[PDB]
Each structure stands twice: as structure tokens, then as C-alpha cells.
Structure 1
Amino acid sequence: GRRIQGQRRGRGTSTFRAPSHRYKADLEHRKVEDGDVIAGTVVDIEHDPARSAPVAAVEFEDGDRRLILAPEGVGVGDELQVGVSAEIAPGNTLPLAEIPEGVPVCNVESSPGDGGKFARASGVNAQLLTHDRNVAVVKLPSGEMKRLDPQCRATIGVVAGGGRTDKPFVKAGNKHHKMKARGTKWPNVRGVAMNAVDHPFGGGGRQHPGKPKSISRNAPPGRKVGDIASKRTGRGG
């Protein structure tokens, strides 16, 4: 048959790529020398076209101006701090070690100095639970308990723009405009609505998969479609 859609994706052609040239900033914690703090002032709040969430323009002391991942409740004129010694306030970035257990936190590094990885999307947060000289235990938005180096830096607060998904798109057009800002191919034709040549679920005199949807982890690309390595399906049971 022919390569399936998920196979076209990997080639990285225009249709599948993010509109990266229209994106504003790669949001990463600024680097501090060591054993220090550094302060900046929030100059502006703007829209982040990669995230559909707001972002804060900060002007730092050493003269550096950059966008940062903004938690809720940050505004123009606010002073923000980054470092070991920074105050504990929404918008400040500190190592997990210096943060009080029980404080909500965002833009958490997976490895120290990586700029941050976890809990970056609208309204989300990580919950810092446990300290140690060894390990910091963090609960991620998915609910997973994550053991992290205490030297991993996080930002205090929950990510801004919470409640984004509360409103229905209501119409195809609204989805459309969002999808233009993303690395996605849209709209979505059901495999079952295709010809056999085009998809494992394609073909037949009526629409139906014609094989179980739960597919093995070991299945090759072009065959791995439907419910991948599903531990269960449905609702009940």
C-alpha cells in the first residue's frame, strides 16, 4: 500500500512543521553565574503564539531583555528575582531546594540549568512536596511523582492563562485558526473512511476497522495505528 499519514509527518515537510518563524521566544530560565541573585523589571505582557498563553517581557539589571514563561498574577512594574537567594514570591525562579514544600510551581527543570521542561502550559502547575539534600519530590500535572535534583530550578506560581480549555471551540473555523499556529496537520480524516491502500482500517463496503484496534508496542510504523499498547479500553470494568 501507501505510507500512512503518520509516516508523512516524520519527513518534516511544510504541511507538518510548526510556523517557527512566527514564534516569539524559546522560553528558558536565564543563566545566573552562581551563588548569586539577579533582578529584572516586567516591562510588558504579550501573547505567546506557540502556547496560546501570555508571556512577560522582563528587563534585567545587567541590561539583558528577554521573554519569560509567566505565571498568573505578574504585571508591568513587578520586580522579579532569579537565583539561590531570591525571595519567595510568584514569578521568581529558584532551585527546588530553596522553595518551601507545599508551594505550587512551574517551568521545572528536568536537569539543573536546562531552562525548564515540566508544567509549562496554560494554568498548570507542579506541586513541590518533599525536600532532602539528595532528592526533591515533585508532583507533575499528570499526577506523576517525579524525583528531581534539588538543584533543578522552578518558577513560583501556576502558569498563566488557566481555564483555556473551559470554552468550546464551537466551530471548525475557530479550530482552524488555532491549528495554523501549530505543528499539526488538520482536519482529520478517519482511517476507516479511507481506502485499504491508505490505512490499515481502510476499505470495506461499510466503515469499520476490520481488525482489533489494540496494536502491539512492537508493531512497525505504517502498522501502528488505533489504540497503541492499550492496557485496557472502554469506560466500564
Structure 2
Amino acid sequence: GRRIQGQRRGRGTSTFRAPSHRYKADLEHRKVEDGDVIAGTVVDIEHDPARSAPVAAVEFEDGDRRLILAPEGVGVGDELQVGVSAEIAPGNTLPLAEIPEGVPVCNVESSPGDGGKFARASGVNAQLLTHDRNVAVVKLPSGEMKRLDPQCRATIGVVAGGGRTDKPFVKAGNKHHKMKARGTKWPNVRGVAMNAVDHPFGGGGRQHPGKPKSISRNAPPGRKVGDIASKRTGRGG
């Protein structure tokens, strides 16, 4: 048959790429030698086209002007600090070790100095639970307990723009506009609505998958479709 849509994706053609040239900033934590003597002032609050969430323009002491992944409650004029000795207030960034347990955090680093990887989407947050000289246990937004190096930096507070998901798109056009700002092909044609040549579920006199939807982890691309290595399906039991 023909390559399935999921296979066309990987080639990285225009249709599947994110409108990168239209994006504003790669939101990473600043690098500080040590000491913490790095503070800046929020100069503006802007919309981030890559995340449908606000972002903050900060002007640092040493003349550096950069956009920052903004937590809720950050405003123009506010002074933010980054470093070991940073104050424990919303919007500041310091290593997990300097953060008091039980405090909501966002933009958590996976490896110390990577600029942040976890809890960055609208209104989310990680929960710093356990401290130690060896490991800082953080609960990610998915509910998972993550063991991290206490040296991994993070920002105090929950990510801004919380509740974005609360409102329905209502119409195709609204989804369309959002989709145009992402690396995604939309709308979505169901496999079962296609011809056999185009998809493992295509074909038939009526619409139905011709086999069980639960596919093995070992299935090759072009065949891995439907419910991937599902431990279970449905709602009952």
C-alpha cells in the first residue's frame, strides 16, 4: 500500500512543521556563575505563540533582555531573582535544594543547567515534596514521582494561563486558528474512512476496523496504529 499519515510526518515537510519563524523565544533559565547576584525587572508581559500562554520580558542587571516562562501573578515592575540566594517568592528561580518543601514549582530542569523541561504548559505545576543531600523528589503534573538532582533549577509558582482548557473550542474555525500555530496536520480523517491502501483500518463495505485496535509495541511503523500497546481499553472493570 501507501505510507500512512504518521509516516508522512517524520519527513518534516512544510505541512507537518511548526511555524518556528513565527515563534518568539526558547524559554530557558539564565546561566549564573554563582553567588545569585542576578536580578531583573519585568518590563512587559507578552503572548507566546508557541504555547497559547503569557510570557514575561525581563531586563537583567547586567544589561541582558530576555523572555521568561512566566508563572501566574508576575507583573510589570516586579523584581525577579535567579540564583542560589534568590528570595523564596513567586517568579524567582533557584535550585530545588534552596526551595522549601511543599511549594508549587514550574519549569523544572531534568539535568542541572538544562534550562527547564518539566511543568511548562498553561496553569500547571510540579510539587516539590522531599529534600536530601542526594535527591529531590518532585511530583510532576502527570502525577508521577520524579527523583531529581537537588541542583536542578526551577521557578516558584504555577505556570500562568491556568484554565485555558476550561473553554470549549465550539467551532472548527477556532481549532483551525490554534492549529495553525503548531506543528500539526489538521483536520483528522479517520483511518476507517480511508481506503485499504491508505491505512490498516481502511476498506470494507461499511466502516469498521478490520482487526483489533490494540497493537503490539513491536509493530513496525506503517502498522502501529489504533491503541498502542494498550494495557487495557474501555471504561469498565
TM over 0.5: yes
| Partner Cα separation in structure 2 for residue 193 and residue 131 of structure 1 | 53
| Partner Cα separation in structure 1 for residue 138 and residue 12 of structure 2 | 34
Shift of 1:172: 0.1
DSSP-derived class of the 2:206 partner: coil
Shift of 1:34: 1.9
Shift of 1:36: 2.7
| Partner Cα separation in structure 2 for residue 90 and residue 115 of structure 1 | 18
Structure 2: unaligned runs, 5 residues or longer: none
Q: TM-score, normalised by structure 2?
A: 1.00
DSSP-derived class of the 1:42 partner: strand
Q: Deviations over 1:75-126 (max 9, x none)?
A: 0000000000000000000000000000000000000000000000000000
| Partner Cα separation in structure 1 for residue 37 and residue 110 of structure 2 | 21
Tell me, yes or no, if the aligned pair for 1:129 and 1:137 is still in contact at 8 Å: yes
Give 2:176's aligned residue: 176
Give 2:45's aligned residue: 45
Tell me, yes or no, if the aligned pair for 1:37 and 1:84 is still in contact at 8 Å: no
Q: Deviations over 1:19-45 (max 9, x none)?
A: 000000000000001233300000000
Shift of 1:5: 0.1
| Partner Cα separation in structure 1 for residue 47 and residue 158 of structure 2 | 17
Structure 1: unaligned runs, 5 residues or longer: none
Give 1:196's aligned residue: 196
DSSP-derived class of the 2:204 partner: coil
| Partner Cα separation in structure 2 for residue 218 and residue 63 of structure 1 | 53
| Partner Cα separation in structure 1 for residue 76 and residue 171 of structure 2 | 35
Shift of 1:213: 0.1
The runs of 4+ residues in structure 1 deviating greater than 2 Å are none
DSSP-derived class of the 1:170 partner: coil
| Partner Cα separation in structure 2 for residue 177 and residue 37 of structure 1 | 42
Tell me, yes or no, if the aligned pair for 1:45 and 1:75 is still in contact at 8 Å: yes
DSSP-derived class of the 1:55 partner: strand
| Partner Cα separation in structure 1 for residue 68 and residue 231 of structure 2 | 39
Q: CA RMSD in A?
A: 0.4
| Partner Cα separation in structure 1 for residue 155 and residue 111 of structure 2 | 15
Shift of 1:72: 0.2
Tell me, yes or no, if the aligned pair for 1:32 and 1:83 is still in contact at 8 Å: yes
Tell me, yes or no, if the aligned pair for 1:130 and 1:137 is still in contact at 8 Å: yes
The number of residue pairs the alignment matches comes to 237
DSSP-derived class of the 1:177 partner: helix
| Partner Cα separation in structure 1 for residue 83 and residue 98 of structure 2 | 9
Identity of aligned residues (%): 100
Give 2:120's aligned residue: 120
Q: Deviations over 1:48-86 (max 9, x none)?
A: 000000000000000000000000000000000000000
| Partner Cα separation in structure 2 for residue 107 and residue 99 of structure 1 | 14
| Partner Cα separation in structure 2 for residue 47 and residue 36 of structure 1 | 28
